[PDB]
């Protein structure tokens, strides 16, 4: 069976050498919580998380390969995607992030290698995160009940301007 690095070689095509994607829209998957990785990857595989292609990709690997692979991605250092955020909005993002997301999205949603569990969002490519949210609000992706509430009702006390502000803030974190 191939080494973790053999299997991870073949993903450099779409999200960077080591998982750090260059522009403009693929997600960087470099520092990734190995637990979150098999969940997502096996989710992609089952079809429950709507993909454009990762269900096709994922379906050819199996749990242990997702483990070898998450083992492989965990040791890399994530590199923030240098892109343009909104200054006027960078700020408001922070505030709203505390008040609604900070509960689970660890310190600006940064890749904290704080042993286990975290959802990387700082320095991730904005188009992706925009898509990410779309699959949520539209119910294409399973969404945890608290993750929802804060988003689904609460964030929207700000409306879409809210999400804009959040997208600008995660992008400032470079």
């Amino acid at each position: 069976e191939p080494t973790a690095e053999m299997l991870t070689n073949n993903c450099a095509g779409c999200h960077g050498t080591h998982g750090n994607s260059v522009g403009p829209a693929s997600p960087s998957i470099a520092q990734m919580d190995p637990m979150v990785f098999v969940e997502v990857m096996e989710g992609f595989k089952s079809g429950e998380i709507a993909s454009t292609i990762m269900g096709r990709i994922a379906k050819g690997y199996s749990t242990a390969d997702f483990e070898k692979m998450a083992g492989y991605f965990k040791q890399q250092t994530y590199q923030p995607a240098k892109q343009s955020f909104d200054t006027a909005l960078a700020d408001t993002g922070a505030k709203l992030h505390d008040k609604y997301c900070e509960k689970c999205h660890v310190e600006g949603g940064k890749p904290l290698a704080d042993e286990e569990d975290y959802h990387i969002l700082a320095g991730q490519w904005t188009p992706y995160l925009q898509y990410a949210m779309s699959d949520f609000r539209e119910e294409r992706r399973p969404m945890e009940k608290k993750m929802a509430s804060k988003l689904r009702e609460l964030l929207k006390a700000e409306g879409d301007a809210g999400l804009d502000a959040l997208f600008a803030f995660y992008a400032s974190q470079q």
Binding site: N10, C11, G13, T17, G60, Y61, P127
Partner: protein, 401 residues
């Protein structure tokens, strides 16, 4: 250790094997022989032809991997003959290699279509290598008279990135609209069916007219319609069933085989492609040379940039560890070829492969891969274009580095 590995060819495949080797253990001096300055991509050139991408965007230097510990000697290889492990190049240099990676690309075979020549290329262009060639075709589409008809002529059998002709027809059709729903793309093909056909047809229906025949693309099947052995600067092509198609811009895409140096060296077989061992890409003909993806026979791995990259890795790893250590291991290879049909409409085919059982035999892992479902929603088609670009930006960075 202080080893010399010579890599002949420094395009996607060659470059990938070069850097990843140097990268894999920096004491090996890796010299990369390539006739030229710049690598013009071809995997997103049809967007230049469609008019959305400047030619500037697909040009790329060796400065990256060079300044990474690879000696980029710009020269064409001329001979290679093993035994006394030497490599000679059109100007007097012979480099000794402990192992060599030959990655030459496709030789296009003009002969096969009587009328076409190396010098016909400049007027009736196959932009199946890019650069200059892509510019010619773009000038011709900018120069066409509104009403002008463009024909595109796929070879058949094995060629490089199969959806290529049809994404070109989509990109061209995308542009032609600049000349009023008044123009036409005519594809005279050598095959009954083709890659991502139903998705291509659904796309075409949706965007450029297609069942409508008040439609901007026309697809004419094959072998009949295979544009054979005649075309002339009377601006006519003649298919194998003798019809004459007069068109203002014709793009003939000639049959292809392993690049010339693979033939001089002795690496090609009966088909004119090089037999490799599937685990390490070493040639089944001459030992110590590893040939990668285009010029090599890799079971269902389509001749693509992606496949080149993957194989490049299996090669890089295969030689470096085999080079100075012990028994390399098992690999997994992957491919996905992306096709953008209109700025908002994109499709893809993707696949995962594994050494099926034992020995030479690359077979796709069952139940995986596929191409954008025909019933794909708006978001998928819209997203895929962006993921196509992302794939480009990433793979040209993974590769030259």
């Amino acid at each position: 250790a202080g080893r010399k590995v010579v890599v002949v060819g420094g395009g996607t495949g060659g470059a990938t094997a070069a850097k990843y080797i140097k990268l894999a253990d920096p004491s090996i001096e890796v010299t990369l022989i390539e006739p030229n300055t710049d690598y013009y991509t071809c995997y997103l050139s049809n967007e230049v032809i469609g008019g959305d991408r400047k030619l500037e965007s697909i040009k790329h230097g060796y400065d990256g991997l060079r300044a990474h510990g690879i000696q980029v000697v710009h020269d064409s290889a001329t001979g290679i003959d093993p035994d006394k492990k030497l490599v000679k190049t059109a100007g007097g240099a012979e480099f000794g290699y402990d192992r060599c990676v030959v990655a030459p690309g496709i030789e296009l075979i003009y002969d096969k279509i009587e009328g076409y020549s190396e010098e016909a290329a400049a007027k009736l262009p196959h932009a199946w290598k890019a650069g200059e060639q892509t510019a010619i075709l773009r000038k011709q589409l900018e120069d066409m008279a509104d009403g002008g008809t463009v024909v595109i002529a796929p070879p058949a059998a094995p060629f490089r990135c199969p959806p290529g002709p049809y994404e070109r027809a989509s990109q061209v059709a995308y542009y032609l609209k600049a000349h009023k729903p008044m123009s036409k793309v005519i594809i005279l093909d050598s095959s009954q069916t083709f890659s991502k056909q139903s998705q291509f047809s659904k796309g075409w229906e949706r965007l450029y007219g297609f069942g409508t025949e008040n439609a901007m693309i026309e697809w004419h099947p094959g072998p009949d319609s295979a544009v054979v052995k005649v075309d002339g600067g009377e601006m006519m092509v003649e298919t194998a069933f003798g019809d004459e198609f007069k068109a203002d811009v014709i793009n003939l895409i000639p049959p292809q085989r392993a690049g010339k140096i693979a033939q001089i060296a002795g690496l090609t077989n009966d088909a004119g492609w090089c037999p490799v061992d599937i685990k390490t890409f070493e040639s089944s003909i001459h030992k110590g040379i590893h040939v990668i993806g285009d010029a090599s026979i890799a079971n269902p791995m389509p001749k693509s940039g992606y496949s080149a990259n993957s194989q490049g890795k299996v090669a890089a790893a295969a030689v470096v560890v085999l080079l100075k250590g012990e028994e390399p291991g098992t690999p997994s290879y992957l491919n996905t070829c992306y096709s953008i049909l209109a700025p908002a409409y994109g499709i893809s085919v993707a696949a995962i492969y594994r050494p099926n059982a034992d020995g030479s035999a690359i077979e796709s892992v069952p139940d995986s891969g596929g191409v954008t479902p025909v019933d794909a929603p708006d978001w998928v088609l819209e997203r895929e274009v962006q993921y196509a670009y992302s794939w480009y930006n990433n793979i040209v960075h993974d590769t030259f580095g």
